[PDB]
Amino acid sequence: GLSDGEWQQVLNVWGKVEADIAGHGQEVLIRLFTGHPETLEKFDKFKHLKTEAEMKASEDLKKHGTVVLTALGGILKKKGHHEAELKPLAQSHATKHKIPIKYLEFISDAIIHVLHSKHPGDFGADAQGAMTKALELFRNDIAAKYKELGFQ
Template sequence: TMSDCELILASWGKVESNLADYGGEVLTCLFTEHPDTQKLFPKFVGIPHAELAGNAAIGEHGKTVLTKLGEILKAKGSSDVIKPLATTHANTHKISLNNFK
C-alpha cells in the first residue's frame, strides 16, 4: 500500500547510505532461507552458504537490487519504473512471477 511505501521511504536513507552492505545482507538472507533461489543467479551458484556473507560480488549485486528497489519505492507504483524491470526479469533473466511472491 502507499502507506507502507511511505513508511519504508521514511527510513530508506539509512539503507541508501550503505547499499552494498545491506544488499549483501539481503541476498545472503534470501539464499540462506531459500537455497533454491541461489540457482537463479548463475554467478553465485558455486558459492557455499558459509561464504555468502561478506562476498564482494554478492554485495555488489545486492547494491543493484536495493538501488532498483529504491527507484520503485520512490516512484510509488508508477508502471514507468516497474514495467521495464519486470520485462527484463521475465524475458532476459527468465524469472517466473512466482519468485516475486
C-alpha cells in the same frame, strides 16, 4: 494503493537502507539464498557460493545487492508511479532471468526480515505495514506483466 502517510513511512525506512545500501543489499541476498536455496540456481555467477561465509565474503554479491536495492529504491521513490521503471525489470525477469513470481515474494519477506534484524526495535509496526504494502504493490505490478507475457 498506499496513502501519503504510508509512503512517508516507506521513504523514512528507506533512509535507513540508503545509509548503508551495500550492507543491506548483501544481507537481503544472503537471507534469500540461505532461506530459499533454489533461488541461488537462477544466478550463474552466484551458484558457486556453497557456504554462507562465501556469500558474506563475496564483493560481487554485495555489488549485485547494491544494484538490486538501487533499482528498488528508485522504484520506491516513485510512490507507485513506476510504470517506466518497472516494465523493463518485469521483462528481463520474465523473459531473460525467468524468475517466477514466488521468488519476488521470497525477497519481499527477506527485506522485512533484514530491516528488523539490522534495526531491532527501530522498525515499528506502522513502518512494517507501510513497507509490506509497498513491496506487495511492486510484486502485484510485476505479476500483471508476467500474466501478459504468459510467464510462470
